[PDB]
Paper text:
The Rex family members are well-conserved transcription factors to control the respiratory pathway, which senses changes in the redox state according to the intracellular NAD+/NADH balance. When the reduced NADH level is elevated, NADH is bound to a Rex protein, causing it to dissociate from the Rex DNA operator. TmRex forms a homodimer, and each monomer was composed of two distinct domains: the N-terminal domain involved in DNA binding and the C-terminal domain involved in NAD binding, which were linked by a flexible loop (residues 78–83). The last helix α9 of the C-terminal domain was mainly responsible for dimerization through the formation of a hydrophobic interface by extending to between the N- and C-terminal domains of the other subunit.
Subsequently, the native structure of apo TmRex was refined to 2.0 Å resolution with crystallographic Rwork and Rfree values of 20.40% and 25.83%, respectively. The refined model contained four TmRex subunits which formed two homodimers in an asymmetric unit. One dimer formed by subunits A and B was well ordered because of crystal contact stabilization, and the residues 4–208 in the subunit A and the residues 9–208 in the subunit B were interpretable. However, the N-terminal domains of the other dimer, formed by subunits C and D, were poorly ordered (average B-factors 79.6 Å2 and 73.1 Å2, respectively). Particularly, the glycine-rich loop comprising residues 55–63 was not visible due to the lack of electron-density maps. The initial structure of the apo TmRex was determined at 2.8 Å resolution using selenomethionine-based single-wavelength anomalous dispersion (SAD) data set collected at the selenium peak (0.9791 Å). The refined models of TmRex contained either two independent dimers (apo and NAD+-bound forms) or one dimer (NADH-bound form) in each asymmetric unit.
Numbering used by the authors:
A (entry chain B): 3 to 208
B (entry chain A): 9 to 208
Write the structure that this text describes.
Amino acid sequence: EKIPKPVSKRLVSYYMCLERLLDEGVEVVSSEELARRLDLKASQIRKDLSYFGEFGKRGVGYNVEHLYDAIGEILGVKKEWKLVVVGAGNIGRAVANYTVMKEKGFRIIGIFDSDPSKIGKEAAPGLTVSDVSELEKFVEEHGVEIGVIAVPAEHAQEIAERLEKAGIKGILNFAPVKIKVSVPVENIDITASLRVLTFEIVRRNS
Amino acid sequence: VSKRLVSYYMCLERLLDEGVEVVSSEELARRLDLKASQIRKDLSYFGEFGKRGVGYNVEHLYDAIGEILGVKKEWKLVVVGAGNIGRAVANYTVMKEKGFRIIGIFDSDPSKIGKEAAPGLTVSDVSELEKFVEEHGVEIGVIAVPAEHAQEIAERLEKAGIKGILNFAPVKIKVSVPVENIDITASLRVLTFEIVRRNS
């Protein structure tokens, strides 16, 4: 157990870079080439990638496909992640019907709401809206890893606290508020994205 | 840089709605997941004007960054793709209140064309996309079609004079105008990377 696993930030950088090389059609890449694309010392790259042994190598370079597969494996890309969605409104339902994430390994196995007129209706094929009163019990019983928050800002922090109390490991947050929890959070906010976009549009003017 | 400024702006906006007058770097650090030292470095751009004591003047920074971001301007949008995501964006009303107004939505599906995607918004034939964009002076194109057709839609938008693109398709678009991507699956993937790191 001597050659060390590369640290997370490195692995993620390799992974995204290898992903580009794959889209480009590159089968073999050298450490020197990785050094230039990643702005990272070639000796470090070789040290890192030696973790994968001869399997990682093809010819005078590295097997782009082998490394993409192996690093993805370490990063949980081959894991089937279990999600729940809280909020069965516009956004929640859209996420429940977003089929392509299912291809990629993200499985929504429950969706919850507090509205009696929503509970019991189908949010998506094979997915029935459950009473949010059951959220903690369900997240614990099914070992749910990711909670998607799709409720209005007013109840987002409360929902987030219930999820982490129930053992959620990460949260994807669509509510227009910054949630404060111990677990990692990724936010999606179409308005924030639009503000970034429009700043860049205006910035082009000289 | 744009992404950081908006993160501040969205936060400060919330704090105003919350009624907070002064916020500390530490409180900003918890909400924005950045180093308090980083927040202090960032917000130093606004000088003593941004400061109240050792903390920050919420209203001062909201206004100043709003100024930098051009928040006063109204933007005209169209959505291409009237499926699950496109319908969802069309019905996302708070962005309309923030000055991003969707005035058209398009699809190539006859079952969808003619029907209403949202209140007051009827789905148009995507064949008329360019014509609509030019005639209505549309500034922002939202791409909500599958990855396979996203690049060509982006090309049609750009030829019609679009100024920027918001892209929901899981593919990298190649055009001359600015592009911002929302990729729910990619965001989930980023999240899982951190989950995995924390469980090792």
